[PDB]
Amino acid sequence: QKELMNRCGEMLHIRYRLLRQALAECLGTLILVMFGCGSVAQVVLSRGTHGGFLTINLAFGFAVTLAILVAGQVSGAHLNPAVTFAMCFLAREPWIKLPIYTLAQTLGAFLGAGIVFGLYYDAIWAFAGNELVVSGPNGTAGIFATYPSGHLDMVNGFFDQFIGTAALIVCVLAIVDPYNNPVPRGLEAFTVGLVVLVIGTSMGFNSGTAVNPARDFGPRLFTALAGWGSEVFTTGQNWWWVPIVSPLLGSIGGVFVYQLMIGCHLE
Amino acid sequence: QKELMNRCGEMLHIRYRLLRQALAECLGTLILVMFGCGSVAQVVLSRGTHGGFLTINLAFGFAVTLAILVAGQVSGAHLNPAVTFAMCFLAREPWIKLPIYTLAQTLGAFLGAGIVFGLYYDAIWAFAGNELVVSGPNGTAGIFATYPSGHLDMVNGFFDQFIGTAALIVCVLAIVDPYNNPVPRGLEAFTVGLVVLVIGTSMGFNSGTAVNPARDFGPRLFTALAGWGSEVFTTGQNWWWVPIVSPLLGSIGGVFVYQLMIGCHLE
Amino acid sequence: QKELMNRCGEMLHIRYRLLRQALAECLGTLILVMFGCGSVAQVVLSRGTHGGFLTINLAFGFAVTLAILVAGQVSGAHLNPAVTFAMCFLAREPWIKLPIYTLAQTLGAFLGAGIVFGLYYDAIWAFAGNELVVSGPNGTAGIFATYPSGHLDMVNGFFDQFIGTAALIVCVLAIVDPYNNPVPRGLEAFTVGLVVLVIGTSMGFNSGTAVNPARDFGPRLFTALAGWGSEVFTTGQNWWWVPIVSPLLGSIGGVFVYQLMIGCHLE
Amino acid sequence: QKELMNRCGEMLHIRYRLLRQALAECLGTLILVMFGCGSVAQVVLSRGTHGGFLTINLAFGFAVTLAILVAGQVSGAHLNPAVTFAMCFLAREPWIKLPIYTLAQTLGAFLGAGIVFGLYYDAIWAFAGNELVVSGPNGTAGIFATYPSGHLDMVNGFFDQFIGTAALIVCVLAIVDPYNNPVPRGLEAFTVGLVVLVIGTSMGFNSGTAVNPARDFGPRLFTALAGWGSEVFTTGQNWWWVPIVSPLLGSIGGVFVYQLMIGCHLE
Ligand SMILES: CCCCCCCCCCCCO[C@@H]1O[C@H](CO)[C@@H](O[C@H]2O[C@H](CO)[C@@H](O)[C@H](O)[C@H]2O)[C@H](O)[C@H]1O
Ligand SMILES: CCCCCCCCCCCCO[C@@H]1O[C@H](CO)[C@@H](O[C@H]2O[C@H](CO)[C@@H](O)[C@H](O)[C@H]2O)[C@H](O)[C@H]1O
Ligand SMILES: CCCCCCCCCCCCO[C@@H]1O[C@H](CO)[C@@H](O[C@H]2O[C@H](CO)[C@@H](O)[C@H](O)[C@H]2O)[C@H](O)[C@H]1O
Ligand SMILES: CCCCCCCCCCCCO[C@@H]1O[C@H](CO)[C@@H](O[C@H]2O[C@H](CO)[C@@H](O)[C@H](O)[C@H]2O)[C@H](O)[C@H]1O
């Protein structure tokens, strides 16, 4: 039986490193999104019976740890176009895989919503009485993509992602810094998981916990074709572009904050 | 006194590796079930006073860590017939111990319910007024075995275990993969504990947190003879077979998802 | 200034290993009790405003980790007369330090209540209106020592500690087993902290989280002389002796469960 | 592109070790305060909808872990003038950097409030209806700095910080003790994070979780000029000086408790 298993391994082997890493990014984001949006569905469809907002933070924080362990060796498990932007901005990785990773991250995050929707098919439909509504007392689209609260405005909503992404970049850069090793090597999976955990508890009130263009726009495109319709994009004065443009500008904002004070002054 | 202790060690020693590993599986599942169903009793019999649903997730997630530390070296602490099925499916372990482990896992999970029932004897009887009812406002049988919610249907209830088991297999396979080591070796106990933790927070709303045939059918057989009666099996249109057949088909569904994208493309 | 610090180090140095270890046990239990009973006061005096029962489990579980790190190298940080009983029962430690550790554990747990009482002096007095009552709607003595619930009886209350202590011993023995090392050495502090964490979430409903004669009877003697009076001992049909005699008989009950199935069958 | 990045690294390099460490302290406290006061804003401005008090403890506890990982190698990430006082008190560090670190810790904690205020600009203003009030049913200044509760008095409020700081010092000293290594080296970031976690759950009811002069007085100076006014300092009979003087006297109170019992009696 072992020979049969070994024979199948050599048949589907691909010698292309770029293609091998793109596949690991599709699975890395699929695990993160399915365990991320799946937890939000648990505390939204149950009206808080099966957990509060701390369940979302623990699940989102520890899903990054699992996604990194799954695909960390193959590609590094960036799981974030903003994170991939920072690595390419520091000459740590070529620019030719910036769109390759993004296409393999947006797709895979789109699949992560499909698994959640098929997992909560009856709960989602019966939440609002066989109808799908983007947001409100019976809103359902907020499970997959993040939406602003009532108090949020456009100007401050932009700066929530900029601050959230900048804090993530500074903490992530210190962990993945070769010259900064305050912990034994190999604990990158656990250390990053805490970073995403405290982000949800700290800055996860205005709109949610996106801090990633793929995790936000990925499942959002799924909800548009899943029954919610065009109302997904036009909610809150075209909110869809805020969690994409802002984190990209927040990635380079965490490089300037970190490198100018710790990264450059290291031996 | 040391000589007396050493003398007793040589008297009960068995040289059979297969028997030695089966005993470690009985204790591994007993610890997992007792700490798993014991936590559910805490938040059900107390009506949420002594904790919410996050207590169940933390206890279930960290009971696997303790059960692995107890029996990891002796047998590996599969604690799941679906997990044991995947290992035998990848030629990592002989097929002759698939029924041996299952018999030593179902038994041991049955004992894990007996310890919980004797631990909460007065609370269980006085929960519904000296009567035992399978489910409802005063239901008690839901502590040991998992039962579907009102919104759950048969078709989607089948796919909850398939999705839950597939996600577990992909994350577990990456951890126990010899060629995939993104973390220093020996942290298998901690990494697996997080996998079961996020499963409860993500997909623990429709029916509960079973994702294991032994943890579901094990204590369920105990409740049938403990006073609940035949109503345990026939609740929800013969729900008992769903958390057994589906995870078995979900174990091979996580092998195809993981190996075809990460496992095969590794050196 | 360094010479002055070095001079003071040699003045108070004691060459007695037994005395040096007893001092580390007084601090190990003081840290555990102060952080244990301090957390219970937070969720009792605030009526759940500043946390639920999960706060108690996290604080009690992670206080053992801190207490072990403080005194693990000096003496091992047993922090439990039942745990010390098991070690002496397996010839791992001489019987002459069983009463020495117990006296240094009960004292030190008594001090751990004094720090908490002085920390919450106004909250405790004003909780019931300048009066001290053992238990009830305004009870205060339940913060330090554990008391049975209304549903609890004498027979089952005895077996809660026996089951709770036996589960602790099996998990602790596997961690401290020289021949059972499923995790890299040195992680004893973290692994034990999870064991006490899941005990509170699983079997912390009937009476509380004692599973230790020193943590239960230690601060209980403090409450008797702190204003509560003789009502502390006579509550619930002389409940004071149950969390002392039962865990002692539960320590040898975890040795027989563990050694007969895993410990003896190891190389 | 790599040459351009390397050229910029050599341009802004400073060869002064004292200045390099001060910059790492500004970022270490900025990360701690922003993730600390940011979490308090989440559970205060949302009226508990987005989390309870356990969210504050988890975020405050794990922010110290992230701040240590960011600046641990550069300077050690004291993040606390009381902690820096203890190190200088044990001849482990020169006295000339006691005011340098404090100035680089108070500043940086002041910035940590500015990021939070800009992150929650609409929520803070609309919390009380376009008005800023120090404390009360609609109070807002309690997010940044800690304020006493109604039951708290002046005498016991002083001893809360003394007990809270002394417990922190004893646990921190044992971790950073070269002669006390019960855990493999390099886990200082994780072990310290648990110490601050249990402090919030244990002694975070009377006033809050300050146990640090920079985290308390830092953002408090920000609130005075941000609209709250002079009422910040004069609330609760000049409460501002209590969380500064008391922790300083509690730092030397943890040295005498720890060194006299464990630290001195070590080889
Ligand atoms: C809700 C949203 C959640 C968002 C979560 C975001 C998680 C971000 C995790 C960042 C992980 C970065 O991981 C880091 O990647 C870089 C990529 O060059 C790796 O870098 C290494 O490998 C790559 C190839 O993979 C080499 O080209 C490079 O020279 C080498 O240094 C690091 O070894 C790894 O530690
Ligand atoms: C609520 C339900 C909770 C469900 C929790 C399920 C937990 C699942 C844990 C899976 C643990 C698998 O653990 C993994 O087992 C395989 C079994 O071959 C071991 O494999 C190793 O040992 C076995 C013998 O034990 C050898 O035959 C094999 O060649 C060798 O590689 C791995 O070293 C171990 O890491
Ligand atoms: C709410 C209640 C909470 C209860 C928490 C209880 C915590 C229990 C922790 C148990 C720790 C045991 O720790 C274990 O102690 C034994 C004691 O012989 C040590 O054993 C070692 O040191 C001792 C001296 O210290 C030697 O005599 C012995 O030969 C050697 O093996 C182990 O190296 C240590 O790992
Ligand atoms: C809400 C408030 C939160 C408060 C949180 C407080 C966190 C406190 C963390 C304390 C960290 C101390 O960290 C410890 O610092 C000392 C400082 O000499 C370092 O000491 C080492 O480096 C320094 C230079 O940096 C040398 O001069 C010294 O000889 C050497 O031993 C230790 O290697 C480090 O482990």
Side-chain angles (χ1 to χ4, degrees):
Chain A
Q1 207 217 321
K2 183 50 167 174
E3 186 70 24
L4 199 50
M5 294 275 116
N6 299 325
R7 180 188 68 86
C8 278
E10 207 36 64
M11 182 35 88
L12 298 103
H13 209 44
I14 38 184
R15 289 328 195 101
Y16 211 173
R17 187 179 187 175
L18 207 53
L19 213 164
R20 280 190 20 233
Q21 297 173 354
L23 262 41
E25 281 296 332
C26 290
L27 201 46
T29 326
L30 185 139
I31 286 154
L32 159 66
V33 167
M34 158 189 72
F35 286 140
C37 313
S39 170
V40 181
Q42 215 206 22
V43 317
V44 160
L45 302 157
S46 65
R47 263 114 182 188
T49 285
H50 275 63
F53 202 82
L54 188 55
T55 279
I56 305 188
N57 316 133
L58 293 188
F60 252 118
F62 290 160
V64 186
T65 303
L66 302 193
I68 281 162
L69 292 165
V70 162
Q73 194 214 309
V74 186
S75 78
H78 301 149
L79 317 182
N80 196 327
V83 153
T84 308
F85 198 42
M87 309 274 108
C88 304
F89 207 65
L90 301 180
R92 197 115 57 227
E93 221 186 69
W95 289 99
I96 211 59
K97 59 185 51 178
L98 176 57
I100 281 270
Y101 274 39
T102 284
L103 286 170
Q105 271 155 328
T106 285
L107 157 69
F110 163 81
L111 293 155
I115 298 147
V116 163
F117 186 49
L119 167 64
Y120 288 110
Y121 197 100
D122 321 283
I124 276 186
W125 273 104
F127 188 54
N130 254 30
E131 305 278 68
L132 293 151
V133 49
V134 166
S135 270
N138 294 327
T140 309
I143 292 152
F144 308 96
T146 70
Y147 284 80
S149 292
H151 67 270
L152 213 48
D153 284 3
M154 201 36 48
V155 190
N156 176 35
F158 186 95
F159 277 107
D160 192 313
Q161 310 297 327
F162 182 89
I163 287 163
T165 318
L168 168 70
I169 287 307
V170 173
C171 302
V172 153
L173 278 179
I175 296 163
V176 311
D177 209 346
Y179 299 6
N180 200 328
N181 38 48
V183 85
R185 261 78 66 80
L187 301 195
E188 183 214 309
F190 298 114
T191 41
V192 168
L194 311 176
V195 180
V196 199
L197 169 55
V198 300
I199 280 192
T201 76
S202 318
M203 32 213 85
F205 168 55
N206 299 268
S207 41
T209 315
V211 304
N212 159 352
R215 181 251 162 273
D216 194 282
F217 187 74
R220 156 165 287 121
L221 193 42
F222 175 81
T223 71
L225 320 153
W228 282 270
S230 80
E231 191 86 21
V232 153
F233 291 121
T234 89
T235 314
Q237 170 94 350
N238 280 258
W239 169 260
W240 61 279
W241 67 267
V242 162
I244 308 168
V245 159
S246 174
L248 284 203
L249 310 189
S251 79
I252 87 182
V255 158
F256 290 165
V257 152
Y258 165 81
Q259 288 267 306
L260 279 179
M261 291 203 333
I262 279 164
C264 280
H265 327 266
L266 267 198
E267 324 265 335
Chain B
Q1 207 217 321
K2 183 50 167 174
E3 186 70 24
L4 199 50
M5 294 275 116
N6 299 325
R7 180 188 68 86
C8 278
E10 207 36 64
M11 182 35 88
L12 298 103
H13 209 44
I14 38 184
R15 289 328 195 101
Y16 211 173
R17 187 179 187 175
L18 207 53
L19 213 164
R20 280 190 20 233
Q21 297 173 354
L23 262 41
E25 281 296 332
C26 290
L27 201 46
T29 326
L30 185 139
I31 286 154
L32 159 66
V33 167
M34 158 189 72
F35 286 140
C37 313
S39 170
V40 181
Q42 215 206 22
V43 317
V44 160
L45 302 157
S46 65
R47 263 114 182 188
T49 285
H50 275 63
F53 202 82
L54 188 55
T55 279
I56 305 188
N57 316 133
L58 293 188
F60 252 118
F62 290 160
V64 186
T65 303
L66 302 193
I68 281 162
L69 292 165
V70 162
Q73 194 214 309
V74 186
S75 78
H78 301 149
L79 317 182
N80 196 327
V83 153
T84 308
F85 198 42
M87 309 274 108
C88 304
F89 207 65
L90 301 180
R92 197 115 57 227
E93 221 186 69
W95 289 99
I96 211 59
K97 59 185 51 178
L98 176 57
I100 281 270
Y101 274 39
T102 284
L103 286 170
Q105 271 155 328
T106 285
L107 157 69
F110 163 81
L111 293 155
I115 298 147
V116 163
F117 186 49
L119 167 64
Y120 288 110
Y121 197 100
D122 321 283
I124 276 186
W125 273 104
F127 188 54
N130 254 30
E131 305 278 68
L132 293 151
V133 49
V134 166
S135 270
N138 294 327
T140 309
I143 292 152
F144 308 96
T146 70
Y147 284 80
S149 292
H151 67 270
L152 213 48
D153 284 3
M154 201 36 48
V155 190
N156 176 35
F158 186 95
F159 277 107
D160 192 313
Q161 310 297 327
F162 182 89
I163 287 163
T165 318
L168 168 70
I169 287 307
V170 173
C171 302
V172 153
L173 278 179
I175 296 163
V176 311
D177 209 346
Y179 299 6
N180 200 328
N181 38 48
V183 85
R185 261 78 66 80
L187 301 195
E188 183 214 309
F190 298 114
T191 41
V192 168
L194 311 176
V195 180
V196 199
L197 169 55
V198 300
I199 280 192
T201 76
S202 318
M203 32 213 85
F205 168 55
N206 299 268
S207 41
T209 315
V211 304
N212 159 352
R215 181 251 162 273
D216 194 282
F217 187 74
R220 156 165 287 121
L221 193 42
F222 175 81
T223 71
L225 320 153
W228 282 270
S230 80
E231 191 86 21
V232 153
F233 291 121
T234 89
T235 314
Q237 170 94 350
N238 280 258
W239 169 260
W240 61 279
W241 67 267
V242 162
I244 308 168
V245 159
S246 174
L248 284 203
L249 310 189
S251 79
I252 87 182
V255 158
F256 290 165
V257 152
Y258 165 81
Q259 288 267 306
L260 279 179
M261 291 203 333
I262 279 164
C264 280
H265 327 266
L266 267 198
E267 324 265 335
Chain C
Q1 207 217 321
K2 183 50 167 174
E3 186 70 24
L4 199 50
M5 294 275 116
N6 299 325
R7 180 188 68 86
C8 278
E10 207 36 64
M11 182 35 88
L12 298 103
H13 209 44
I14 38 184
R15 289 328 195 101
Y16 211 173
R17 187 179 187 175
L18 207 53
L19 213 164
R20 280 190 20 233
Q21 297 173 354
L23 262 41
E25 281 296 332
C26 290
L27 201 46
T29 326
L30 185 139
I31 286 154
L32 159 66
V33 167
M34 158 189 72
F35 286 140
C37 313
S39 170
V40 181
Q42 215 206 22
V43 317
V44 160
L45 302 157
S46 65
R47 263 114 182 188
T49 285
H50 275 63
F53 202 82
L54 188 55
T55 279
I56 305 188
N57 316 133
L58 293 188
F60 252 118
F62 290 160
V64 186
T65 303
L66 302 193
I68 281 162
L69 292 165
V70 162
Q73 194 214 309
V74 186
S75 78
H78 301 149
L79 317 182
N80 196 327
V83 153
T84 308
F85 198 42
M87 309 274 108
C88 304
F89 207 65
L90 301 180
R92 197 115 57 227
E93 221 186 69
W95 289 99
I96 211 59
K97 59 185 51 178
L98 176 57
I100 281 270
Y101 274 39
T102 284
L103 286 170
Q105 271 155 328
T106 285
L107 157 69
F110 163 81
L111 293 155
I115 298 147
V116 163
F117 186 49
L119 167 64
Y120 288 110
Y121 197 100
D122 321 283
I124 276 186
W125 273 104
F127 188 54
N130 254 30
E131 305 278 68
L132 293 151
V133 49
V134 166
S135 270
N138 294 327
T140 309
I143 292 152
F144 308 96
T146 70
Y147 284 80
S149 292
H151 67 270
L152 213 48
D153 284 3
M154 201 36 48
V155 190
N156 176 35
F158 186 95
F159 277 107
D160 192 313
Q161 310 297 327
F162 182 89
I163 287 163
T165 318
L168 168 70
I169 287 307
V170 173
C171 302
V172 153
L173 278 179
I175 296 163
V176 311
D177 209 346
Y179 299 6
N180 200 328
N181 38 48
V183 85
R185 261 78 66 80
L187 301 195
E188 183 214 309
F190 298 114
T191 41
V192 168
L194 311 176
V195 180
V196 199
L197 169 55
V198 300
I199 280 192
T201 76
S202 318
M203 32 213 85
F205 168 55
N206 299 268
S207 41
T209 315
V211 304
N212 159 352
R215 181 251 162 273
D216 194 282
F217 187 74
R220 156 165 287 121
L221 193 42
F222 175 81
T223 71
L225 320 153
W228 282 270
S230 80
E231 191 86 21
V232 153
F233 291 121
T234 89
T235 314
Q237 170 94 350
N238 280 258
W239 169 260
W240 61 279
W241 67 267
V242 162
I244 308 168
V245 159
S246 174
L248 284 203
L249 310 189
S251 79
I252 87 182
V255 158
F256 290 165
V257 152
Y258 165 81
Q259 288 267 306
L260 279 179
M261 291 203 333
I262 279 164
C264 280
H265 327 266
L266 267 198
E267 324 265 335
Chain D
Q1 207 217 321
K2 183 50 167 174
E3 186 70 24
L4 199 50
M5 294 275 116
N6 299 325
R7 180 188 68 86
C8 278
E10 207 36 64
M11 182 35 88
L12 298 103
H13 209 44
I14 38 184
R15 289 328 195 101
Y16 211 173
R17 187 179 187 175
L18 207 53
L19 213 164
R20 280 190 20 233
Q21 297 173 354
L23 262 41
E25 281 296 332
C26 290
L27 201 46
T29 326
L30 185 139
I31 286 154
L32 159 66
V33 167
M34 158 189 72
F35 286 140
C37 313
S39 170
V40 181
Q42 215 206 22
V43 317
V44 160
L45 302 157
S46 65
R47 263 114 182 188
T49 285
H50 275 63
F53 202 82
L54 188 55
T55 279
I56 305 188
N57 316 133
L58 293 188
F60 252 118
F62 290 160
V64 186
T65 303
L66 302 193
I68 281 162
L69 292 165
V70 162
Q73 194 214 309
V74 186
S75 78
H78 301 149
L79 317 182
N80 196 327
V83 153
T84 308
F85 198 42
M87 309 274 108
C88 304
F89 207 65
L90 301 180
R92 197 115 57 227
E93 221 186 69
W95 289 99
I96 211 59
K97 59 185 51 178
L98 176 57
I100 281 270
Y101 274 39
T102 284
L103 286 170
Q105 271 155 328
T106 285
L107 157 69
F110 163 81
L111 293 155
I115 298 147
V116 163
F117 186 49
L119 167 64
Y120 288 110
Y121 197 100
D122 321 283
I124 276 186
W125 273 104
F127 188 54
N130 254 30
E131 305 278 68
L132 293 151
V133 49
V134 166
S135 270
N138 294 327
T140 309
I143 292 152
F144 308 96
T146 70
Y147 284 80
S149 292
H151 67 270
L152 213 48
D153 284 3
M154 201 36 48
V155 190
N156 176 35
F158 186 95
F159 277 107
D160 192 313
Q161 310 297 327
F162 182 89
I163 287 163
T165 318
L168 168 70
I169 287 307
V170 173
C171 302
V172 153
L173 278 179
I175 296 163
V176 311
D177 209 346
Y179 299 6
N180 200 328
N181 38 48
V183 85
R185 261 78 66 80
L187 301 195
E188 183 214 309
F190 298 114
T191 41
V192 168
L194 311 176
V195 180
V196 199
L197 169 55
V198 300
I199 280 192
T201 76
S202 318
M203 32 213 85
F205 168 55
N206 299 268
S207 41
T209 315
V211 304
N212 159 352
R215 181 251 162 273
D216 194 282
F217 187 74
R220 156 165 287 121
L221 193 42
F222 175 81
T223 71
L225 320 153
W228 282 270
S230 80
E231 191 86 21
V232 153
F233 291 121
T234 89
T235 314
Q237 170 94 350
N238 280 258
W239 169 260
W240 61 279
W241 67 267
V242 162
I244 308 168
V245 159
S246 174
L248 284 203
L249 310 189
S251 79
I252 87 182
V255 158
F256 290 165
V257 152
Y258 165 81
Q259 288 267 306
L260 279 179
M261 291 203 333
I262 279 164
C264 280
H265 327 266
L266 267 198
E267 324 265 335

